[PDB]
Amino acid sequence: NPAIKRIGNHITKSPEDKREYRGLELANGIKVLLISDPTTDKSSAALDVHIGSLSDPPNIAGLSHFLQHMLFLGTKKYPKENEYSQFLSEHAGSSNAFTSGEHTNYYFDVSHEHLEGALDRFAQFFLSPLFDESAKDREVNAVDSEHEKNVMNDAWRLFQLEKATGNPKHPFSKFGTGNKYTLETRPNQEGIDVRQELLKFHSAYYSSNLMAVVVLGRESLDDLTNLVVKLFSEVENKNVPLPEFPEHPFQEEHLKQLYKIVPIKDIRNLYVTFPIPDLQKYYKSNPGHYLGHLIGHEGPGSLLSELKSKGWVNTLVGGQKEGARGFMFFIINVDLTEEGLLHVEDIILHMFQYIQKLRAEGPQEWVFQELKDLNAVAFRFKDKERPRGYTSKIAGILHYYPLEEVLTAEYLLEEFRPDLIEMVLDKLRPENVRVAIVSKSFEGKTDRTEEWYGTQYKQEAIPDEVIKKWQNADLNGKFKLPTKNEFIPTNFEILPLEKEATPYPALIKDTAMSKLWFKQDDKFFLPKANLNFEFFSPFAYVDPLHSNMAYLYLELLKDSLNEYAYAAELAGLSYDLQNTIYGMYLSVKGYNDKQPILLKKIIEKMATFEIDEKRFEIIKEAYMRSLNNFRAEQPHQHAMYYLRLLMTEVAWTKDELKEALDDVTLPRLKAFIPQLLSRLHIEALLHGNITKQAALGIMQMVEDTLIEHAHTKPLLPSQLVRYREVQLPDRGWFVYQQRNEVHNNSGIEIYYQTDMQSTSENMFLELFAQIISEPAFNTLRTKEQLGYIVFSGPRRANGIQGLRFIIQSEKPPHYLESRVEAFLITMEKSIEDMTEEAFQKHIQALAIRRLDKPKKLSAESAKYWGEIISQQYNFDRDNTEVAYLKTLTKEDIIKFYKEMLAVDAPRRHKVSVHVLAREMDSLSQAPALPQPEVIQNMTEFKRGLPLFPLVKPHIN
Amino acid sequence: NNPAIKRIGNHITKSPEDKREYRGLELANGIKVLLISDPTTDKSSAALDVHIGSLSDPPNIAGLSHFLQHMLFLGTKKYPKENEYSQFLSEHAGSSNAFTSGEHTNYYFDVSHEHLEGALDRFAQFFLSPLFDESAKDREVNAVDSEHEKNVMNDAWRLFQLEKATGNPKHPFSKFGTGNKYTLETRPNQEGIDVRQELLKFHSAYYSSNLMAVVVLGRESLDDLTNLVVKLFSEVENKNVPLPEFPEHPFQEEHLKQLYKIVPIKDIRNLYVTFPIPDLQKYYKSNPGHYLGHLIGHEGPGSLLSELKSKGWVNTLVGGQKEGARGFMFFIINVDLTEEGLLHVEDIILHMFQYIQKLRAEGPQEWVFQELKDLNAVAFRFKDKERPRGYTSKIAGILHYYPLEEVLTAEYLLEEFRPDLIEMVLDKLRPENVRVAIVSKSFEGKTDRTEEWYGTQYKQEAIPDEVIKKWQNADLNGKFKLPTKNEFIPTNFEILPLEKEATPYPALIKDTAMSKLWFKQDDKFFLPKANLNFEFFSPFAYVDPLHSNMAYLYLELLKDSLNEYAYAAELAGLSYDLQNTIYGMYLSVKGYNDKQPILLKKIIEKMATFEIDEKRFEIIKEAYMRSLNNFRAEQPHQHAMYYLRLLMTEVAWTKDELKEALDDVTLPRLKAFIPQLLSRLHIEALLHGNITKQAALGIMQMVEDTLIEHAHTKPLLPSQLVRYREVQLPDRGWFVYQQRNEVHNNSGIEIYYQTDMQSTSENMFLELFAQIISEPAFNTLRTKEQLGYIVFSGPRRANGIQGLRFIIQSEKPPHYLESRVEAFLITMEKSIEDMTEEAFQKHIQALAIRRLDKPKKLSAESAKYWGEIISQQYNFDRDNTEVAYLKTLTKEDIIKFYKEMLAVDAPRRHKVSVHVLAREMDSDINLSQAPALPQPEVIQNMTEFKRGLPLFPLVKPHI
Ligand SMILES: COC(=O)NC[C@@H](Cc1cnc2ccccc2c1)c1cc(CCCCCc2ccc(NC(=O)[C@H](C3CCCCC3)N3CCC[C@H](N)C3=O)cc2)ccc1F
Ligand SMILES: COC(=O)NC[C@@H](Cc1cnc2ccccc2c1)c1cc(CCCCCc2ccc(NC(=O)[C@H](C3CCCCC3)N3CCC[C@H](N)C3=O)cc2)ccc1F
Ligand SMILES: [Zn+2]
Numbered sequence A: 001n002p003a004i005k006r007i008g009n010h011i012t013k014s015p016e017d018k019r020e021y022r023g024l025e026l027a028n029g030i031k032v033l034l035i036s037d038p039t040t041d042k043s044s045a046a047l048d049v050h051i052g053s054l055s056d057p058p059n060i061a062g063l064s065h066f067l068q069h070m071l072f073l074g075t076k077k078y079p080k081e082n083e084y085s086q087f088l089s090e091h092a093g094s095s096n097a098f099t100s101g102e103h104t105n106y107y108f109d110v111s112h113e114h115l116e117g118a119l120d121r122f123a124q125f126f127l128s129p130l131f132d133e134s135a136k137d138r139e140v141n142a143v144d145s146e147h148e149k150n151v152m153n154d155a156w157r158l159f160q161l162e163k164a165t166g167n168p169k170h171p172f173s174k175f176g177t178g179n180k181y182t183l184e185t186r187p188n189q190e191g192i193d194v195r196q197e198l199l200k201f202h203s204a205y206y207s208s209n210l211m212a213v214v215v216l217g218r219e220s221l222d223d224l225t226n227l228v229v230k231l232f233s234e235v236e237n238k239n240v241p242l243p244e245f246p247e248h249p250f251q252e253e254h255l256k257q258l259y260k261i262v263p264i265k266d267i268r269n270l271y272v273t274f275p276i277p278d279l280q281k282y283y284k285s286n287p288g289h290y291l292g293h294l295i296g297h298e299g300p301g302s303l304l305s306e307l308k309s310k311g312w313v314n315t316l317v318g319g320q321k322e323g324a325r326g327f328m329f330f331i332i333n334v335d336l337t338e339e340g341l342l343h344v345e346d347i348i349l350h351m352f353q354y355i356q357k358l359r360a361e362g363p364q365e366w367v368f369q370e371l372k373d374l375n376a377v378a379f380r381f382k383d384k385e386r387p388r389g390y391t392s393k394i395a396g397i398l399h400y401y402p403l404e405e406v407l408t409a410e411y412l413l414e415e416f417r418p419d420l421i422e423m424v425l426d427k428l429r430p431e432n433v434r435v436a437i438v439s440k441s442f443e444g445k446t447d448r449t450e451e452w453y454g455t456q457y458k459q460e461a462i463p464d465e466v467i468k469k470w471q472n473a474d475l476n477g478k479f480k481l482p483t484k485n486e487f488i489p490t491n492f493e494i495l496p497l498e499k500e501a502t503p504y505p506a507l508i509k510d511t512a513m514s515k516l517w518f519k520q521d522d523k524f525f526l527p528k529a530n531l532n533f534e535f536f537s538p539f540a541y542v543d544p545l546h547s548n549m550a551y552l553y554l555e556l557l558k559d560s561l562n563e564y565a566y567a568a569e570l571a572g573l574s575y576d577l578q579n580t581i582y583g584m585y586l587s588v589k590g591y592n593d594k595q596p597i598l599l600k601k602i603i604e605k606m607a608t609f610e611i612d613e614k615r616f617e618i619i620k621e622a623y624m625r626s627l628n629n630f631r632a633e634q635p636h637q638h639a640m641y642y643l644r645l646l647m648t649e650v651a652w653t654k655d656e657l658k659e660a661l662d663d664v665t666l667p668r669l670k671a672f673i674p675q676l677l678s679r680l681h682i683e684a685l686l687h688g689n690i691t692k693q694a695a696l697g698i699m700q701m702v703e704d705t706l707i708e709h710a711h712t713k714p715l716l717p718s719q720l721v722r723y724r725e726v727q728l729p730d731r732g733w734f735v736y737q738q739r740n741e742v743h744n745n746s747g748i749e750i751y752y753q754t755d756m757q758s759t760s761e762n763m764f765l766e767l768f769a770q771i772i773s774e775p776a777f778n779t780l781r782t783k784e785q786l787g788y789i790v791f792s793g794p795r796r797a798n799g800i801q802g803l804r805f806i807i808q809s810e811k812p813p814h815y816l817e818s819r820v821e822a823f824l825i826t827m828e829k830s831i832e833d834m835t836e837e838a839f840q841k842h843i844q845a846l847a848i849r850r851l852d853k854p855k856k857l858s859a860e861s862a863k864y865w866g867e868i869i870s871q872q873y874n875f876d877r878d879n880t881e882v883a884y885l886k887t888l889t890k891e892d893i894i895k896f897y898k899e900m901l902a903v904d905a906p907r908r909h910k911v912s913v914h915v916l917a918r919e920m921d922s923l924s925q926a927p928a929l930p931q932p933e934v935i936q937n938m939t940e941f942k943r944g945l946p947l948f949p950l951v952k953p954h955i956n
Numbered sequence B: 001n002n003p004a005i006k007r008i009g010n011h012i013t014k015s016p017e018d019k020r021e022y023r024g025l026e027l028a029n030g031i032k033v034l035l036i037s038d039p040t041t042d043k044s045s046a047a048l049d050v051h052i053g054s055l056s057d058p059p060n061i062a063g064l065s066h067f068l069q070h071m072l073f074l075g076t077k078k079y080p081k082e083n084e085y086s087q088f089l090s091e092h093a094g095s096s097n098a099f100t101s102g103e104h105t106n107y108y109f110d111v112s113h114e115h116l117e118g119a120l121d122r123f124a125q126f127f128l129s130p131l132f133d134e135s136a137k138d139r140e141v142n143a144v145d146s147e148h149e150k151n152v153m154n155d156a157w158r159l160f161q162l163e164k165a166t167g168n169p170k171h172p173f174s175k176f177g178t179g180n181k182y183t184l185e186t187r188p189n190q191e192g193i194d195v196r197q198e199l200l201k202f203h204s205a206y207y208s209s210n211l212m213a214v215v216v217l218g219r220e221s222l223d224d225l226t227n228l229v230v231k232l233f234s235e236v237e238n239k240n241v242p243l244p245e246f247p248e249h250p251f252q253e254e255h256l257k258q259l260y261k262i263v264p265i266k267d268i269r270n271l272y273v274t275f276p277i278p279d280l281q282k283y284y285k286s287n288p289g290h291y292l293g294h295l296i297g298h299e300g301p302g303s304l305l306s307e308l309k310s311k312g313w314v315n316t317l318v319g320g321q322k323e324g325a326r327g328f329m330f331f332i333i334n335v336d337l338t339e340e341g342l343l344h345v346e347d348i349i350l351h352m353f354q355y356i357q358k359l360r361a362e363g364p365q366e367w368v369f370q371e372l373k374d375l376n377a378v379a380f381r382f383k384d385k386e387r388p389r390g391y392t393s394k395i396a397g398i399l400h401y402y403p404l405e406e407v408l409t410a411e412y413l414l415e416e417f418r419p420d421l422i423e424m425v426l427d428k429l430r431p432e433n434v435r436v437a438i439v440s441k442s443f444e445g446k447t448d449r450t451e452e453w454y455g456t457q458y459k460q461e462a463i464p465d466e467v468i469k470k471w472q473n474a475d476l477n478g479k480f481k482l483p484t485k486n487e488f489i490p491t492n493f494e495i496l497p498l499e500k501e502a503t504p505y506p507a508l509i510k511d512t513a514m515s516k517l518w519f520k521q522d523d524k525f526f527l528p529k530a531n532l533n534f535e536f537f538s539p540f541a542y543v544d545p546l547h548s549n550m551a552y553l554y555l556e557l558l559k560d561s562l563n564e565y566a567y568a569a570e571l572a573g574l575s576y577d578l579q580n581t582i583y584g585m586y587l588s589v590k591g592y593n594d595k596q597p598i599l600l601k602k603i604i605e606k607m608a609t610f611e612i613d614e615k616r617f618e619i620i621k622e623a624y625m626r627s628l629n630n631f632r633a634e635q636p637h638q639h640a641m642y643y644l645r646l647l648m649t650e651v652a653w654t655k656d657e658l659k660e661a662l663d664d665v666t667l668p669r670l671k672a673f674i675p676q677l678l679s680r681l682h683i684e685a686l687l688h689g690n691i692t693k694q695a696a697l698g699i700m701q702m703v704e705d706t707l708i709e710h711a712h713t714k715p716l717l718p719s720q721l722v723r724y725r726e727v728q729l730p731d732r733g734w735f736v737y738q739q740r741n742e743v744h745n746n747s748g749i750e751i752y753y754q755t756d757m758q759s760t761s762e763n764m765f766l767e768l769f770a771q772i773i774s775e776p777a778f779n780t781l782r783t784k785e786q787l788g789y790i791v792f793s794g795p796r797r798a799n800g801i802q803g804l805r806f807i808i809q810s811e812k813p814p815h816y817l818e819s820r821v822e823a824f825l826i827t828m829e830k831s832i833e834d835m836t837e838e839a840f841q842k843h844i845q846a847l848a849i850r851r852l853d854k855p856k857k858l859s860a861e862s863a864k865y866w867g868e869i870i871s872q873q874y875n876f877d878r879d880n881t882e883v884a885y886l887k888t889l890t891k892e893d894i895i896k897f898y899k900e901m902l903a904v905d906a907p908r909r910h911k912v913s914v915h916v917l918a919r920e921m922d923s924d925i926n927l928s929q930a931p932a933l934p935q936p937e938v939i940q941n942m943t944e945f946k947r948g949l950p951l952f953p954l955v956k957p958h959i
């Protein structure tokens, strides 16, 4: 009761937000944000400790991360380690945590009815944790699993490298993840007891004065106040001074430096970094966001436009980057063409030229006003968040903003400060520049190796003559400030719900040219709409060449429209356009206001598109590398790719695609585009703040624009063919084996093909997947330690389904095969032995997952789109299937497992894909497995088997 | 020596390549005989040709000679049983047939070589003691009426009788030869005429041995055949009947300079030009009509056709002499018409007269005659061995026109050049002697006459003297020039020695990403010929209706542009076919191997460097549209078979989709399509004949090099070489697809009982059941129940799958045909239960012999090899393997198979029916009990049918 230091004033929110908020500070120093939502399906809480990796002891790298994993392992009130995860498993909840350089954030979600139970378990870890020594080894192996995952990832390698080139005395040079070496091998050699140092670090840094708690639930602000006071007033205050790092990790000796790095994928990137002071205090004016907007701009007269026109880069990322408290960065990152890689000095000269233009022309208030106005719209009409991510995020921002500004934080801009823009800009100079070039052209040309990832690199001082040239940069007439953004929305009217509005999408047009699904939004009432279009053409996937031409076409289309579309994206109007195995997919999402102008520009450009030869050659080269770079993808990704090729009627391989790519000449592409658009079928979904008439008007405008400019005619119904799944023989087992040449981990996908999708077959598979879900993770991952990726669940494709297992392990594929099979028998027992109460808990847990209500329009549109892309159109599926699921018995599941999934099942349809590790050679009792039929040639495999029928669509 | 033999002919001129032995003789009763000894023959044959036909019919019964044809072979005093000859032949792998023309009635049969005497004895009995079973009178009248009812709906038969109806009505040429229900029943009954008594009067008046000719072919020696024929045909009664002669031409002055406007059934635009001529038969050693037909009907540069095509009036032309009867003949010039041609008939005829007058001005050419003589000399020498049945029937006719020694050289050898005779014939080709007939639907409603026998709507007009004058006065036209020396005439007839590494079946001698080459050097016929087959694969030939139309148009324009050059090769026995398929293009080059690489090079170069002429493109595009619409006028059984292929194949474009897409085929789109089609290909070839391994490899490389060079051809990926699958029918399912034929008033049906994928066992289970039911299906459904004119049964094979099919065309509704077929399968189930092991082994043996039956010419062997290649099974030794398995089969194996797959209540029944309704139709009697049939699932949309079903795998290859 007197355990509250203060209660904040009104928590500034959007008028559209019905959730009720209350900010307060407990006597111990804990900053609190309470969120009352009587409608919420799930309740949630989050605690963020303002201590992270940058505070790790130098002798124990990754200790903050280690403590994150250890803290939630038993308490005095709840001594069992399983208690927290078990309680959330039993009440449709989840939990997760993350460690950054200055924060350790713990969070969970649970069924709205069980907030007190869940929060009670959570709070105890912050009162009397036990840090159980039984799980010490397994948590160390978990931390090591995470680091080993990131070792071959080019982004994590670059992330650590930057840290290695700065001041080695600075906490910024620290390795924050940790691994087996830093948490076991080195402490043991050095005579460090990990447990006493863990306990030590905890005692010194885990103080309430550095903690922020966020609670979201059905309960009122008052009941939420009472609960948070009850469970968090006991958090010990040690009055810890919040760590600051005001010295920049890049001093004079770390500047005017050039780095030459070797990547894993065939990627070519340039990274330009300027050390800057911490700009967080100026958040109400945000001069870094201001400069980020201009330097990063993609509209006409932009730095990017000229860099692209010069044929040097394709993409650009610019602006402020976080460091820690006391130090930040201003970055200008570009990818490089083959010509760009030879014109790095020229690229950086253009970057400095652009910076100089902003200096000569000075700050612009109209630009800042535009940013302010866009941010206000974006905040006002922000989509509703899933509570788990909402609490976690707020727990962090509580440490940086007054209680009342916690929601507006990342949005509201106020005073224009030209003084600060001038200040930040004055730091963007050649004397302060850091350059990093990433390219395979440096293989065998480097002398240094980064210890944690093995990254190969060289370091050079940039010559004074180069710095002088960049300092002396002329003024370029190609660079001009962006003009006023005509995509800024103004019409925010929510259209009244029509008399004839429907709960699900309805077919409001069914012609030879198009099938139109429409639903006026009756849930979110934000001034937005989602416009999904599926274009069908037999010429988009007829052969590898055409598949490449479909891809090149849309990539060049997007490239040409970019300068125009960028203003729309800044204004909350975005689109996606990609080729499919059937034609093209187009999606326009955001504010409905200017939506038809963007859409009409896109349909027009599709049909009157004139290709720039220089861009075509550059996009073709980037696509060749992209096809090659798949070799550097994870072995499980490879295993899942090989199974889609094997099981789909028609599927062109990356090898066939890259082989036909050389035959894509410009005259062939120019000929392809009219041929592709000559005959189409359009299937659309228009969902949102729109009427039935407006929907018809949109569809009609897309047809009319194509008919006018491309002379489009409808396709024949007989031409609208969908690919079938390969029908496996009863009691058959096939294996397809390949090698991953990059990763030293194995990849596997095991598919037990069941049958064609139907209400009954769907829920047999979904309930069996629900039953074995937690156990497969506990047995195969927790107990057996097979690998970081242990996945099980239903697999659905082309109207067909089955059960799959996906594993990425150090162990061989044939071994994982016997382990999965061992588990299948272990579950045969576990189902016969479980109680009816336990069985009914699985049915309830599935029904809850299946009825999870979308929190935003996009999530609902995606669910409707799923029904459309599969041609099933079962919009009421969830309700029907849940109702059917509740009528299932334990016997039904036993009958099904016996007929389809058991080792001795009469209708067993097994197909495995084995992806060997880079260096790889070519417990419960595992059952006797037959000799597999090995697949040498995919064409012959496919030819030798029947093809399933295609699922019959659900009709009104 | 023999008193029954009037005279034995001298040496029968034969080909030096022919191993068969020949003997000509005349019996004392006047019968002219040819005996053919062939110890090699699998089937023996005999034919009798009576020099009496339709032209001799009495006025009271039109079609009597033809009715006699049917009645004569129904019982004899020695073999009273009506169906003896039929059953005997059927029991010994034989067959029989007959035809009645205006001057001949020809009866023929074939049988297993071990049963010539048995078959010949029953055959001879019809010319000694016929009975004409009064019980089979009505069924014969119905058979004659069904035959005419089929002809009524045919454009060529209509024109045939209409030509006869526009001559002198008083001349026997105007007679209706077929007969029908009216002439054989309706009319004689209304007049008290005794059909039988009048039939017998005719037979007793005209059937005389001095007007008869007999050919016997067997494994027996010439001497044994001599004794056999003397024994069986010397007792045939001689009534010394005089040979009917027709010296007066049926076309007299009043039938000349006449114009006819005719309405056809199909949307066809044709022009027929005719001139009466004396009978030229007796000039056969010089053949002036052949010489003139060769020049008038020429298609090489300077030809009449070339100029009619350039003017855009016609696409095709046929020209030459046409048989009439003893005493009269016709000279014809027939062309089809473009839309413009139909408007320029007067000009087309002027051009025809210009070419004629040019021949007159140029005068006969000895060198032209020499080429024809030399070509015919090559043709006779290197002639393919004829099928025995057709061979005897042909000679039986020819025996009436030529001395015994010349019956084989008859229609081949040219001796003396007679420029005077050429001149005599050309003198009759003048505008004052012309007859002109235009056939077009543009005349519908614009006519006033009706030819009553067929119902043909026509109009007759005299040709203005004004028009005749223009034709008579036609200016000289320089576009008409005589053909030049035919450089394609073969000279190298060397049979290359059989290579040391020669194989009995084709061998894969080239296996690349671009091409699969199957090759076999001929080791049986040793004739200087070769067959070159190429299947060019492309996913763009059938990707959609448009591309399918473009592949069609492409190859039609290409055959049209190569035609002038190709025609000389065709005359020199070097022919080619080029067609689009559902997988790409098919090319076959057949004939004398000599100049073969030259023609092949020209076809491939032209394919790769094709320059389309806009005028031709529009004409061919217009012809194709009509060809697509003309499918509506095809018979209902043809429609039923087409609909089933649409339904059962993974991908298939309908005639309506093809014609909907045709208007989009522009000249720029077709020009873009060709390099696209040829850009990526796979070539699968079969080269079989008088060629070596080196020569075969050189041919394929030349084809590849030509495509690579001019079309920049690259290979297709093995994953792109996808074949279409058959639809997999559900166990115990019955599906029905129904449509209507808007032209014919007869139903069409195809019933398909899908079994399973082709395999040694499945194939022979189906082929033995098909063997067992084959004859009974005909005798029951066609002969006894009179279901229809068309009754067919046998295995169906498509996309590696098989089943049992029934194809029937009837006047009765499709659902009634369904019950009769179903009752018949019950009769067949009972029949197999009841049949003796003896009768069962006879079925195994009849099938085994049929399957092991050796090909008699190179093309028949290559076709067998091509069948294995196109199906991608490549099982060239199949017959030996399948016959060996078939022989192990028991009666129980077939009952088990019938019970599981075909029975009405079979657990794995897979029935699909196509019902084609008649034009005007809408939807005990001591007969077999039809079973309880379920309600069929009516297919409304073909796409939904295919989507809702699995697709079978494809058969695994042998190689
Ligand atoms: C944090 O991880 C890393 O640091 N990894 C390494 C570094 C490169 C690095 C650098 N010097 C090195 C010297 C030596 C040795 C190694 C080095 C390594 C690296 C950096 C990044 C950058 C990550 C930080 C992202 C923070 C951020 C910064 C700018 C933006 N703007 C925009 O989004 C702007 C936008 C314009 C409107 C106003 C607000 C900003 N933006 C929008 C999208 C497109 C547009 N062109 C644009 O612009 C966004 C995020 C990504 C990969 C990478 F490997
Ligand atoms: C016997 O059948 C018929 O008679 N049917 C009727 C008529 C139409 C008709 C005609 N006048 C009519 C007046 C008034 C009212 C109605 C009429 C109706 C008709 C005739 C035919 C012709 C049938 C007889 C066939 C005899 C024949 C004649 C010439 C040839 N040459 C060639 O094949 C020549 C060949 C060149 C080398 C030397 C030998 C001749 N030939 C080769 C192929 C192509 C080339 N252009 C060529 O040329 C062939 C057969 C075809 C259809 C048709 F409806
Ligand atoms: Zn971790």
Ligand SMILES: [Zn+2]
Residues within 6 Å of the ligand: B066, B070, B143, B144, B147
């Ligand atoms: Zn007949």
